Amino acid sequence: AWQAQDSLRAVHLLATLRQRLSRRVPLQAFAGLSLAERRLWVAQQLAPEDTSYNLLAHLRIVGATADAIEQALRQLLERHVALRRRVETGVDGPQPHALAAHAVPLQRLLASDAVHAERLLEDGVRREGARVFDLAHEAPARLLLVVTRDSARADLLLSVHHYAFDDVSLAVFAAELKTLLDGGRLGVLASTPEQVAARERAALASGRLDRVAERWAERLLPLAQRLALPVSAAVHAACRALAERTSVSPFSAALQAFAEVLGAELGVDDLLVGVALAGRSRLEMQGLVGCFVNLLPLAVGLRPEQSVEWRLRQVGHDLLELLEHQDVPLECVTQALRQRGASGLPIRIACGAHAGVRVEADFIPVPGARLDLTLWLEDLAVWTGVSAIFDLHRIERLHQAWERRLLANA
């Protein structure tokens, strides 16, 4: 398990050991629709013409025929029900209904050369970016397959609504596509998006997740344009060294400097920071396709009187607590806060981190921002902010302050 594998890899290590030898180990001492699907679906209902929930994935495939690619995609659509479901509104919750795999639109186009293949792709990007999905009557996914004449390269544009997809789903979809195009076989899936929702309803009914949310509501109660810049090697090394001395993850050190820079910028002593989590809490959710992402709050205290090491231990500790209980939906934390006299929790800032046929898959970023400012680290610092608050030049200034804060803390 060790040789097969960050702190998310630590969760995967503890899950493999739990499946083989039983008994937990709690990470902190070593390091119908689900609510994840529903919160994206209801946000689309409140703004039906908003297309900021359209996910566009570009898959570059080298070494497979058009017939083999199309056939492999029909297999993946049959295998992953989340890409071929319609959603009826319900009296006590939206209700999904499975559709046939052939009902997913698939358009094959032949391009004369590579430049023509780019232009077909760009035209598809603009068309799918402005498209309003009919989530009640059609599948939430479309596919554009562009093959280039006299070339081994084929391009696949996957447009799928966010309620039925996420980042890990793209990696699973791309790897399984490569497996089929190579001639391999896919094992029987151990779960479905519907089973995840059913298990969540049981966990909600047992009060287990709400008790964890009530514990978090204590600390959280007082608080109740895209730019991609490369991180210098000196800042990356200092981030790693600071984490090794503090026994936290390198992401915890980068989150701490992120919250401290923004806290000084906004002039506050405490800053609420969201942490985007993959939300696949059990081993059989690792190979699923759908939406499992869960944004959970993290209260960072900006105490200049305290040491850098102590502030970092608190950040990394609170981070592993959110990682352990990433199955606790954000709505549970909101419910616990309202039960203590709060209108809600106001999250404005967030953070996160990401032989044979060749399959390269990447998302085309979604324009517009729900949150005021986000920082995503790619193993590259991707800053996304609302233009009216965090413009391009203000983001560049914050990234420089973030890099300085990291070097100073180390």
Author numbering: 746 to 750, 767 to 792, 823 to 1015, 1034 to 1163, 1173 to 1197, 1203 to 1233
Sentences from the paper on this structure:
Non-ribosomal peptide synthetases (NRPS) are multi-modular/domain enzymes that catalyze the synthesis of bioactive peptides. A crucial step in the process is peptide elongation accomplished by the condensation (C) domain with the aid of a peptidyl carrier or thiolation (T) domain. Here, we examined condensation reaction carried out by NRPS AmbB involved in biosynthesis of l-2-amino-4-methoxy-trans-3-butenoic acid (AMB) in P. aeruginosa. We determined crystal structures of the truncated T–C bidomain of AmbB in three forms, the apo enzyme with disordered T domain, the holo form with serine linked phosphopantetheine (Ppant) and a holo form with substrate (l-alanine) loaded onto Ppant.
